[PDB]
Amino acid sequence: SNAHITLDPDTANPWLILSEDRRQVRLGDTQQSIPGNEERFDSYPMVLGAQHFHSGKHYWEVDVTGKEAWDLGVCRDSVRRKGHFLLSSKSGFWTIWLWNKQKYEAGTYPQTPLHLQVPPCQVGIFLDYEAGMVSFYNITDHGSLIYSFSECAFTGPLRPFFSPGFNDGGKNTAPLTLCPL
Ligand SMILES: CCOc1cc(Cl)ccc1-n1c(CN2CCNCC2)nc2ccc(F)cc2c1=O
Numbered sequence: 001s002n003a004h005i006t007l008d009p010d011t012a013n014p015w016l017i018l019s020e021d022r023r024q025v026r027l028g029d030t031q032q033s034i035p036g037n038e039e040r041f042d043s044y045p046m047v048l049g050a051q052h053f054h055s056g057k058h059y060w061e062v063d064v065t066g067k068e069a070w071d072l073g074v075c076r077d078s079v080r081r082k083g084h085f086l087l088s089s090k091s092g093f094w095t096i097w098l099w100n101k102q103k104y105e106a107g108t109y110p111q112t113p114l115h116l117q118v119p120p121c122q123v124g125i126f127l128d129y130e131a132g133m134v135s136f137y138n139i140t141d142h143g144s145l146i147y148s149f150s151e152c153a154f155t156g157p158l159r160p161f162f163s164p165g166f167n168d169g170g171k172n173t174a175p176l177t178l179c180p181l
Contacts, residue, residue: 001058003160005173006022006052007022007048008048009022011039011040011041011046011081012040012041013041013046013047014031014034015046016045016047017028017032020033022080022099024049026173026176027164027166027167027173028092028168040081042081042082042083043055043083043084044163045163045164046071046162048160048162049160049161051159051160052158052159053129054156054157055082055130056129057127058127059151060179061122061124061161061179061181062125062175062178063121063122063177064122065096067120069099069100070163070164071095072097072176073087073093073094073099073160073161074094074160074161075094075106075159076157077091077166080158089107093107094152095135095161096114104139104146104154105120106146113149114131114146116141116146117141117144118144120138120140122139123138123139124136124139125160131133131150132150132153133148133150134148137150
């Protein structure tokens with residue numbers, strides 16, 4: 001089931017610029033000044049979707065065209081927001097990412113290298129709560145499976161997870177965009 005995802009402003013790390021529609025996010029040129037509510041990611045440029053999922057099946061698409069790094073997927077709502085962590089299946093995160101413009105990996109511990117034929121301009125996330133799966137699909141390549149976590153022992157609600165980059169050092173100015181449908 002198609003989910004209409006929007007970004008939660010309360011989770012967004014200071015370094016992030018959300019669109020006004022809540023459907024787009026880019027890494028910014030310096031921190032912004034906002035509060036330090038407990039829901040906000042202090043240590044890395046991450047933000048959640050507003051939707052919580054307690055059950056059922058949910059699909060959404062993210063445009064990543066041009067970007068040299070990024071991280072997508074799903075996480076426990078109960079993940080710590082304050083401080084340092086890895087994006088690991090062991091630690092409440094079901095993610096894939098592009099690092100360094102060339103290296104796709106999936107957030108196993110330790111992570112798993114992905115060899116993609118067609119580099120994705122667009123990525124699908126499919127959450128099946130009851131199955132205990134999070135699946136990533138390469139839309140550019142007609143929906144080929146990028147990677148799938150299974151036997152995820154979902155307890156409590158989950159959130160869509162996003163990060164458009166780690167350091168604006170490069171030109172990671174382009175946004176993650178949530179696609180219509
Ligand atoms: C590929 C780069 O990975 C990282 C880079 C930095 Cl600067 C900080 C943390 C990580 N990272 C991370 C988090 N980063 C992943 C890549 N995108 C940025 C966040 N997750 C991991 C999960 C499992 C594992 F075995 C290792 C890692 C890991 O090293």
